Amino acid sequence: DIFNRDPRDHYDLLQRLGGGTYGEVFKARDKVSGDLVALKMVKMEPDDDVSTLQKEILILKTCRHANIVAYHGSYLWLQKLWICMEFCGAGSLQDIYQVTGSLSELQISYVCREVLQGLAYLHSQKKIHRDIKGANILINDAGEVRLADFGISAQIGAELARRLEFIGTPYWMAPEVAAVALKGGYNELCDIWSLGITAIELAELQPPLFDVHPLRVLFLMTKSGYQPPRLKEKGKWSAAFHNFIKVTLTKSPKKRPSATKMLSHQLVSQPGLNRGLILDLLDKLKN
């Protein structure tokens, strides 16, 4: 499961695709089959024992869903853990909308449906993603939608910096999560709020309040009079899209709908939602 060897023995490392608190991602080609894969390098911390690392790799191999990037295998080499995963050729939705411009209501509807399918699966496994945003939703050349990973819960490498990263960029987090280090916890419903913000992000090219200093956003969010965000242009988006934003951005998590409940919302249960919508979006990259 975790080969004690250099992944360069089996893979030809191509260009760097990007990275962050979750590691460094490289495009790579298998030397035998010729197939393209993604290789993520996670630097191991001084307290990352291999017994806990083994439990995590077991979770990475069993936590599987069509709307989550497939895990192929891993390598432990020179204090760096390398995870091999399916290659999503078009990159993230942020990589796409920062070329194409705003997604159509139908395109956002399909992405939100596919993400909710992945979130409903993660929540059935008692996992909370806690990292839903356009940059963490990848698209393959077939227009399929996949979450890059199952979220922040992987206890590998820079887990703490990844867990706390929202403090410097809290725009996608639910108010009960933005109430960091206060007595109230949170639950899986915070992912539903993050998906509502992601839908405004795909419509507007940035989440609400993106230009406000992160510490000011945290302050505003933990106020009793905080009004959840809304789409900026009412006379472009349908009543169904406005309502989907209204219910996903419910301030109280005790009133916010589950991922399974959201899958029957009129916006994401409408006919004609399929990968063809994203194939049309990818065609705009040529122009």
Ligand X SMILES: CNc1nc(Nc2ccc(N3CCOCC3)cc2)c(C(N)=O)nc1-c1cncc2c1ncn2C
Is 211 an annotated catalytic residue? no
Q: Is 103 in the site for ligand X (CB under 6 A)?
A: no
Identity of the residue, 264 or 287, whose beta carbon is nearer to ligand X in the bound complex: 287
Q: Which two tokens stand for residue 83?
A: 């995870």
Q: Is 91 in the site for ligand X (CB under 6 A)?
A: yes
Candidates 11, 87, 97, 186: give the one binding ligand X (CB under 6 A): 87
What would the x/- binding string for ligand X be over residues 134 to 173, using CB under 6 A?
A: -xx-x---------xx------------------------
Closest CA to 154 of 54, 75, 78: 54
Residues in the chain: 287
Q: Which residue has the tokens 């077939």?
A: 142
Binding-site residues for ATP, in ranges, read: 17-25, 40
Identity of the residue, 152 or 245, whose beta carbon is nearer to ligand X in the bound complex: 152
Candidates 2, 7, 11, 22: give the one binding ligand X (CB under 6 A): 22
Query: Measured from the CB of residue 204, what is the shortest distance to ligand X in angstroms?
Result: 20
Candidates 69, 173, 192, 195: give the one binding ligand X (CB under 6 A): 69
CB neighbour list of residue 200: distance below 8 Å, 6 or more residues apart:
207, 208, 229, 231, 245
Q: Which residue has the tokens 């639910």?
A: 174
Q: Is 71 in the site for ligand X (CB under 6 A)?
A: no
Distance from the Cα of residue 230 to its chain's centroid: 21
Identity of the residue, 169 or 243, whose beta carbon is nearer to ligand X in the bound complex: 169
Count CA atoms closer than 13 A to 246's CA, side-chain side: 10
Identity of the residue, 87 or 244, whose beta carbon is nearer to ligand X in the bound complex: 87
Q: Which of 48, 95, 131, 191 is catalytic?
A: 131
Residue 38: how many other CB atoms lie within 10 Å: 20
CB neighbour list of residue 142: distance below 8 Å, 6 or more residues apart:
275, 279
Q: Which two tokens stand for residue 192?
A: 């539903």
Residue 109: how many other CB atoms lie within 10 Å: 25
Q: Is 25 in the site for ligand X (CB under 6 A)?
A: yes
The residue at minimum Cβ distance from ligand X is 91
The secondary structure of residue 206, as a DSSP letter, is S
Q: Is 117 in the site for ligand X (CB under 6 A)?
A: no
Site residues, ligand X (CB under 6 A): 17-19, 22, 25, 38, 40, 69, 85, 87-88, 91, 95, 135-136, 138, 148-149
Residues known to be catalytic: 131
